[PDB]
Amino acid sequence: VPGEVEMVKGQPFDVGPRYTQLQYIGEGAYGMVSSAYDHVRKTRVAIKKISPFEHQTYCQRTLREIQILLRFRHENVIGIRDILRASTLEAMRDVYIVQDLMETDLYKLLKSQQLSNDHICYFLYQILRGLKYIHSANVLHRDLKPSNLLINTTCDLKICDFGLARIADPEHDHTGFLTEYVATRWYRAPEIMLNSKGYTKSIDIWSVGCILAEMLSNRPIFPGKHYLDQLNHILGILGSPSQEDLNCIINMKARNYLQSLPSKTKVAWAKLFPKSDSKALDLLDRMLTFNPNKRITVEEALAHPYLEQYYDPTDEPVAEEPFTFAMELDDLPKERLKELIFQETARFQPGV
Ligand SMILES: Nc1ncnc2c1c(I)cn2[C@@H]1O[C@H](CO)[C@@H](O)[C@H]1O
Ligand code: NA
């Protein structure tokens, strides 16, 4: 009963005999994710097809994702069940990451129903419980948003796609005005368009800040066409930055842009969100600060009263050891990255 190559969309998904009955799950600026029947574990799983190697940048992102996910182990973080790839370096064209199948994502859920303050609260907790574990290893997701937040029928939640993940390092965070980035625009912290590369845990807190407002209204906050517009959507709600708040902002252009913007007063949350728990609104406020230095940490957030029903310090594991990368890897020929990916996946080879 051979066959293999079922194709999701119009691309091959060579994962059989183990898995068959493939079904496209969705996007992935990264790779393509499908669901399939695992014949040994006799259960349906999710399997992402990554096809890098022809782009050094993709190679980097794929290697980081793999290396991190292979080393992480946490309930609110998606693990890797197996990794399929060619037994020959030369013949390896893509990598197949087999992961536990989740029913939906937070984005699909927000589009289908209005969450109760109870659901909103529980998902925030979980997101933060995973965030704590991730930050403990000094890792930054940098692309937290509704789609990267998988959820099952039992309301379980686990963080997604670490393709843009990197290690903190606030030493090389300054970058200059209007220096672009890859992460999803609607969730970019304001300092991203002003003077930051997003190399500090504060970048993750803002995103979660956006996600909370989102679960509270079933709509982005902050959309933005339109880079920069994004910067203006934020100021629209936060109001014009405080003096010393800048300021903190010595970047000629950044400081002048902000200066040329018509004064705008902050919009009370309880105003843009009438009928939402005050406890939740207070946390949000502390997550969406214009200044990254004043932004609430992942730990104080979990300790915030709105999560008091879930907060439990002896049941929110932390990373055993921090992580660090090259050291050269950023500037390295994509082929040498193919070897690292071929080595990192070695242990899953039914053979070598
Ligand atoms: N294990 C899983 N179960 C179900 N869906 C999954 C996963 C994984 I890994 C990713 N996705 C969905 O695919 C989208 C693109 O990354 C993500 O936004 C998400 O929609
Ligand atoms: Na994923």
Helix pair 278-287, 117-136: axis angle to 10 deg? 30
Which residues 6+ apart lie within 8 Å of 159 measured at CB?
76, 77, 78, 127, 130, 131, 134, 141, 144, 148, 149, 150
Evaluate whether 285 touches 212 at the Cβ level (below 8 Å): no
CA dihedral in degrees (96, 98, 101, 107; nearest 10)?
-40
Candidate list 38, 82, 105, 143, residue with the active-site label: 143
Experimental technique behind these coordinates:
X-ray
Domain segments of the chain as ranges: 1-101+333-350, 102-332
- 1-101+333-350 CATH, one of 3.90.1300.10, 3.40.50.880, 3.30.200.20, 3.40.50.1820: 3.30.200.20
What's the chain's length in residues?
352
Q: Amino acid identity of 233?
A: H
Beta carbons within 10 angstroms of residue 144's beta carbon: 29
Evaluate whether 166 touches 137 at the Cβ level (below 8 Å): no
| Token pair belonging to 312 | 């439990």
Q: What Å resolution does this PDB entry report? A: 2.4
| Token pair belonging to 115 | 């969450």
| Token pair belonging to 33 | 């994710």
The response to whether residue 161 sits with its C-beta less than 6 Å from ligand 1 reads yes
Atom of ligand 1 nearest to the CA of 160: 9
The response to whether residue 78 sits with its C-beta less than 6 Å from ligand 1 reads yes
Residue 117: name the closest of 209, 210, 216 by CA.
216
Q: What are the CA-CA distances from residue 13 to residues 41, 43, 159 (Å)?
A: 19, 18, 24
- Name the residue of 102, 141, 184 whose CB sits within 8 Å of the most ligand 1 atoms, as the mutation to test its pocket: 102
The residue assigned the tokens 């018509």 is 262
What is the Å distance from ligand 2's center to 130 Cα?
15
What is the Å distance from ligand 2's center to 248 Cα?
36
Evaluate whether 111 touches 26 at the Cβ level (below 8 Å): no
Residue 155: name the closest of 179, 190, 206, 120 by CA.
120
Q: Which residues are annotated as a binding site for ATP?
A: 25-33, 48
- Cβ-in-10-Å burial (0-12, 13-18, 19+) of 88 comes to exposed
Beta carbons within 10 angstroms of residue 227's beta carbon: 14
- 102-332 CATH, one of 3.40.50.300, 1.10.510.10, 3.40.50.1970, 1.10.3720.10: 1.10.510.10
The residue assigned the tokens 């997701």 is 141
